[PDB]
DNA sequence: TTTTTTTT
């Protein structure tokens, strides 16, 4: 028979059970295991999930099979195999991959489909199991956990460039030239003492020809343990997980990803010259599967239905920060920034990103920081930090080993960034931020390190007026006291004020008190909301409109006529673009421009802003 | 040439005595044998660590001597050469090891699965530690009995690092000190098993050194039987493994002689005891003190000089059930526990009972709340004390810091803002920037005391703004973009500009603080010192009694002990009450009234700053804390009015003039 | 030398 050493896990019985789990495994098994009998759909449930996946996989011709734990736990034959994998992954996964390969071969031959059986025989079919176990704190790991799949969550601190992973050794005789290939067993080579040709059998003439030898691809990624898992006692740990094969270079830095992989430990040479190994063992993990943090026709239908709703604008605005009371205009602005404008990358004149930049300067206690926390949570690529705890070097780029470290902005490139207490943040680091946001790119100029980097990301700044409470006596510009260039760089500026409105105070107190009532206290499903925003960004592409352009011209002429920098024009342009995107419009409209101007005036409180003196009438503010 | 030396010890006799003790000894005086019961749990795989209490050994020795025996004085014996005796105890445990009971845990244990298989193929063969799954340990002798007396010269007495002397090498000892740093846990092998296909034999190399060299060849018979030369392969599954961690304990400043730098000892921990320690926490540790051998070349370089380390048998913490429950119902039945505790706070200090009450409320802390939408509002409470110099403010803060189990004391000038929050050390090793937990990090789930907070730098003041309102600490310094939970409570001490308050100056001007800062505090106390002949006499009498008698004059008051307050405070903090709607209406009306007052009360003479939602949240936190003290499941309107009274008193102290 | 938090 075929059994796994030290486990009493019969490889033959394992193969038979996993085969029956491959064909004759209805998704009904999974759903019933998950109960949800009110959500069972015959087609999906009665479908042999894995057989359909294998058919679509042959159609795609890929050799990788993502696999959840629940499917194994649903099939009685493979329910035991689930625990077998949990205990002794490597062997189980190897047997399982072989079984998948054989099942594909059977499917092509059984279905007599015109397919290259050699290709499938050549296709190294693999299984990428996921959900193997409940996500456990990495710090919680202990030695006995070694040799087991450990579902893990974390943030990608950094990743190494791919490394040649020696695969099969190739030798050659130095007297008769006869060659032989030694496969790397257990990461070691057993060189032939004498020539494989007994005719020659020359001792030590067999030499390893590095170039002729076979190598694989390996990469390693540092993954930070999430703050949820770690305790207050100490800083989060990180593990340099070793990735291999296609999984290599399958994630950038700052990627909130959940990964399942076997827990691995190895010796380490105490003295490189000698074979003496330190008693303690280096520990790593081999990710068999990676989870990052397709819009189904049903999902698209829901998206378009919500788009049909007129409240879409205000509905999303409230949905992004459901707990926040009021502040609908600020919510709408940040919602637009989440949507972002259109990135018309002109072949000439450079690229023109449709980015949106919103600063929040106003009297404190206004939840601005809480709003920043929300924004960071929402954006899939979020970067939260505070100026005081932030450094310009660490913000954008940090020299290292000679090598460079990505800064906070770099970790936001293609995402949203949050800089709390932006006013407190140093003026020098402010100047650093100026050009990078202006060009959406980091320019580096240092001894031996001189280059530029992509920094296309939105920033959500939170500031406080020079006077702790915004002083209407001081002009708005004086109240903020920020560089006029920097001021222009930002697209929107909400001047939140704590006007003493007994009615509004009553209502906000009601909100907060009600929250207090429920120990654990409409709005879109944040997941569905994110899907909406994504689909809009990727598929929808707003384009300027004739009426829109005419109105923009007239509006900016008025602005400059009343200062209206050209960046103001680009700001309203990108804002109308993001509005159309919010409306799932690939074409801009006059109404988008009108909304852009309206919100521009709102955030600056232009309605209450004094026509002269640069001040704002607090009585006019919120009337 | 290795001359034999007679010594008054017979390991065979001592082993026999050990076996007799284990099988025989039971905690009958306290009450099968308790040690046999533990071994039975081990057979059940219920426990993987065994603690043999030297006090139990002493009790057994007393029983034998009273019976009359050639006692081997094991309890004393273990102290001189602990490690060999630990090995002997482990062997005895194996000898007296009971069979499994109920259901054994070898459902998938590869050892049990294959060890028998290996035997069936075969049908000490393998190292005893390979099969052994129980971590032996020794509890230190209780100093309360000190029955050794003349023998108990200082055995239990914890000794500073410098107090340690090479003579103590190879001997169990006790040390009190703070844990400077703790390494991350790492695995280590007691036994290494190689597998070679040619033999099919799984050899079992056992390693006790810091490092080892691989066998790389088969002495296994099967390869020898065929004359084949085996290519041994490491088998992690087969090889035994144990968790290891390293901790460094440093001398206490009190222990440190004047003009002498503190000394620190490296500590090795293995098995279950790993991770028991926590950095920066005072702890008393007992364990075998052993030399650390070198690598061959570094050994030749060092020669007879040897590194030394400590292997901790047991750990005792000076600070962190039913007994607790009865202890607390005692005070609960006593009643008025709130005011009783407030008075019990700072027994030295006289008066300011309202301040003590507010400090107690801060100690319990407000309920931390998280919303389904994902909102989380800081339940911690922050109070500022702004008063004329020499009014015992610093003394009060130090008293609180001592009172709270996790409290940390700090001064603005002595602490850097970066160090206060977190520091990025460029070169710990290899010039790699590393974040360092600041004083606040040390204060996590604890109270941080900041003196001369007015003298504190304004920039660092803004730095702490983030942490105090928002628990987490976000750091984007060079090479480190990270966030720290950093949940802690803040108490700040400062004095009015120009030293003391000026009635001519407005309260805000005398405060001289950013409005954002001011609001972020839940409470500010404007305690002021005015000459009052009668009050001065009373305070002087109290202080004079305190000097004459160290205990403060009883004044018909009874003060609960620190351990008791900490216990009751933990229990109360466990409550987490939920408030009611009538309270909502009351608090909403009060907040509206206060906001209207501020909206009309901008006058410098009576201007204390505009009311803010943070004020309402602080009021709610104070009410919840009051409920915690009263232990009610829900906040009561009484608590709300009490918190309002506290705030009103804080503000009116000046208005009283 | 160059870059770099951090304290002095
Ligand atoms: N409109 C609002 N809705 C809900 N909560 C609010 C609102 N305005 C203020 N708050 C609360 O007021 C508190 C202020 O928190 P912050 O986020 O620090 O305020 P802020 O606007 O960021 O001003 P800072 O940070 O002090 S400069 C939080 O507890 C918020 O929940
Ligand atoms: N009510 C009191 N009860 C007991 N001792 C008191 C009292 N008021 C003052 N003292 C003593 O008088 C001195 C007051 O100064 P300190 O306690 O050293 O610092 P403090 O100035 O009171 O507080 P600061 O301003 O934050 S340093 C201390 O020696 C106190 O012990
Ligand atoms: Mg805030
Ligand atoms: Mg003082
Ligand atoms: Zn040859
Ligand atoms: Zn062999």
Author numbering:
A (entry chain 4): 177 to 469, 500 to 607, 614 to 733, 740 to 780, 792 to 852
B (entry chain 7): 4 to 34, 60 to 151, 190 to 386, 394 to 730
Give the published text.
The replisome that replicates the eukaryotic genome consists of at least three engines: the Cdc45-MCM-GINS (CMG) helicase that separates duplex DNA at the replication fork and two DNA polymerases, one on each strand, that replicate the unwound DNA. Here, we determined a series of cryo-electron microscopy structures of a yeast replisome comprising CMG, leading-strand polymerase Polε and three accessory factors on a forked DNA. In these structures, Polε engages or disengages with the motor domains of the CMG by occupying two alternative positions, which closely correlate with the rotational movement of the single-stranded DNA around the MCM pore. During this process, the polymerase remains stably coupled to the helicase using Psf1 as a hinge.
To test this hypothesis, we performed a rigorous 3D classification focused on the C tier of the MCM ring of all replisome particles. This analysis identified six conformational states of the replisome, referred to as States I-VI, which vary in both Polε stability (Conformers I-IV) and the location of leading-strand DNA lining the MCM pore. In State V (4.5% of the total particles, 4.12 Å, equivalent to Conformer IV), the leading-strand DNA becomes disengaged with Mcm5 but is further translocated onto a surface formed by Mcm3/7/4/6 subunits. At this point, Polε becomes highly dynamic and invisible in the cryo-EM density map. However, in Conformer IV (equivalent to State V) where Polε is highly flexible, the same CTD interface appears largely disengaged, despite the domain-swapped helix of Mcm5 still packing with the CTD of Mcm2. In agreement with this observation, the measured BSA for the CTD interface of Mcm2:5 is significantly reduced from 6792 Å2 in Conformer I to 2381 Å2 in Conformer IV. Correspondingly, Polε contacting motifs on Mcm2/5/3 subunits are remodeled during the transition from Conformer I to Conformer IV, largely disrupting the binding surfaces of Polε on the motor domains of the MCM ring. Therefore, in Conformer IV, Dpb2-NTD becomes the only part connecting Polε to CMG. In State V, DNA spools onto the inner CTD surface of Mcm3/7/4/6 subunits. At this stage, the ATPase centers of Mcm7:3, Mcm4:7 and Mcm6:4, which are intimately associated with DNA, have a compacted configuration, while the other three become relaxed with Mcm2:5 showing the largest displacement. Using Mcm3-CTD as a reference for superimposing the CMGs from these two states, we observe an obvious tilt (~18°) in the State V of the MCM-CTD ring relative to that of State I.
